Amino acid sequence: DFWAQGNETNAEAFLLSIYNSFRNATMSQRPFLTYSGDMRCAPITAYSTGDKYVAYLANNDMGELRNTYPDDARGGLIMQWDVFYTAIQDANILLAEIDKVPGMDELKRSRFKAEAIFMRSLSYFFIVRAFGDVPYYTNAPLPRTNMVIVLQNCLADLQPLLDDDPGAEVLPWSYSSYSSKGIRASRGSVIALMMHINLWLVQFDAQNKEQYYRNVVSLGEELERNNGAYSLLDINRSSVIFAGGSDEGLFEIAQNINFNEIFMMNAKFSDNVSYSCLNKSMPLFCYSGDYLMTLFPMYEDDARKELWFDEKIYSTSVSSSAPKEIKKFWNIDTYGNGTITSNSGNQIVFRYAGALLLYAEALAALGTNDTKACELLNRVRNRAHASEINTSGSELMDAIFWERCRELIGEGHYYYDLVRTGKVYNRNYCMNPMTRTNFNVGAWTWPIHRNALKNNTQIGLNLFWE
Numbered sequence: 001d002f003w004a005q006g007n008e009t010n011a012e013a014f015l016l017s018i019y020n021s022f023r024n025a026t027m028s029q030r031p032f033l034t035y036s037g038d039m040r041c042a043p044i045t046a047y048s049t050g051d052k053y054v055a056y057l058a059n060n061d062m063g064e065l066r067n068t069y070p071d072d073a074r075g076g077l078i079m080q081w082d083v084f085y086t087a088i089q090d091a092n093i094l095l096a097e098i099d100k101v102p103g104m105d106e107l108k109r110s111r112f113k114a115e116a117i118f119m120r121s122l123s124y125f126f127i128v129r130a131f132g133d134v135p136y137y138t139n140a141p142l143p144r145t146n147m148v149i150v151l152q153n154c155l156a157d158l159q160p161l162l163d164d165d166p167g168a169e170v171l172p173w174s175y176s177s178y179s180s181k182g183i184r185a186s187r188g189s190v191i192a193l194m195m196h197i198n199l200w201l202v203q204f205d206a207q208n209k210e211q212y213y214r215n216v217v218s219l220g221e222e223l224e225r226n227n228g229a230y231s232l233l234d235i236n237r238s239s240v241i242f243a244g245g246s247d248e249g250l251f252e253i254a255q256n257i258n259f260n261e262i263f264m265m266n267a268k269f270s271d272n273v274s275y276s277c278l279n280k281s282m283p284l285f286c287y288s289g290d291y292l293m294t295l296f297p298m299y300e301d302d303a304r305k306e307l308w309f310d311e312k313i314y315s316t317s318v319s320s321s322a323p324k325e326i327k328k329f330w331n332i333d334t335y336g337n338g339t340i341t342s343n344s345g346n347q348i349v350f351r352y353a354g355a356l357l358l359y360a361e362a363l364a365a366l367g368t369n370d371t372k373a374c375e376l377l378n379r380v381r382n383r384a385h386a387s388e389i390n391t392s393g394s395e396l397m398d399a400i401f402w403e404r405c406r407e408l409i410g411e412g413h414y415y416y417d418l419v420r421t422g423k424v425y426n427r428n429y430c431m432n433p434m435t436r437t438n439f440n441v442g443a444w445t446w447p448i449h450r451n452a453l454k455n456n457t458q459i460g461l462n463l464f465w466e
């Protein structure tokens, strides 16, 4: 009925409910993205020890996180994949039913299908990164499917979106409407996701890593056919990047304060690392000054130092009396009854600087063109007014890893980059590492909440936490 007697407008509303569910899973009903991607194994300390989840995340004490916060948005909810599966199941429905909509525009029909496939793939990717093996279905009780299979099947679903649409008509490179720009899947969204999926396959299906890296290079070459749709904004216009809808964004989760589409405060990295614009005496947490002295060396130029951090960047104080904040994302606004957020912007899931660094990373790992890898890296270095890098081999691979840590701080990549590179168990790259043995038995995953077992009797838990 909804479909067979529907129309483009109702099909689009249904598609937008898929985006809504993904937003709920990541930002609006759970602080999933920032807990799982920024905070976990990060060298961070709470200003108030009563905020126990900060240390638990820092220390990978995920079992104590689940005992202290069993059901709520500081732990247990994040351990539930239910909201991502709402997105997945609605994508499955749209794909099964949309051909029934009488006489709608066929370009729009093809676009909505492409967007639904993208969002399904993005949801599966996000839950694989958090949970490991996950139940896999595309039919509108199943066991957990091998994460390598899930990732490979996602890649297979996404590839045709590029190959069948050589003109970027069904998914354009970018949208000119503010109602779509950054927040509806584009060709660039698809490319970035595929690069991430390949790089996860490098870690977890390593026997085929040469092919996955080659895939990322291929994807980079395609990204660079965007003909000026994407660009790196000036570093002094950083707030324009993080507001959302900029020419640097590749995929973003929409926030719209005026329309009551508001992320949880605790879900927004910015709101956890700011105080002066929020009428608070200190933020939720801060980064080690030693870490930031490593990350942003004091004797080398880098405009991110001045523009993204306050003057206490290197402070080793974790004192209430001497707080420090990160100002990278500031786009301050108020809503409801006087509630202030430091970041009214979209959450930037993938952006062009990140994708250029992934392209560089893959090239450097293949060892086939270190000069081009440097060129890519240096586009990001030059935008930050940091020194150009001219190196090769292991030094180049390290440079690109550390550059992603500098460039993407607070955007939900830190922990996940550590996992997919194996650096999460290496003290040379992570201040709060886990052990390699613990990694090998699944200590990089989140616990799976018992609610997942009610919903599906064929599900085994993540046993490191059991």
Ligand SMILES: [Cl-]
Pocket: 350, 351, 354, 355, 358, 413
């Ligand atoms: Cl990225």
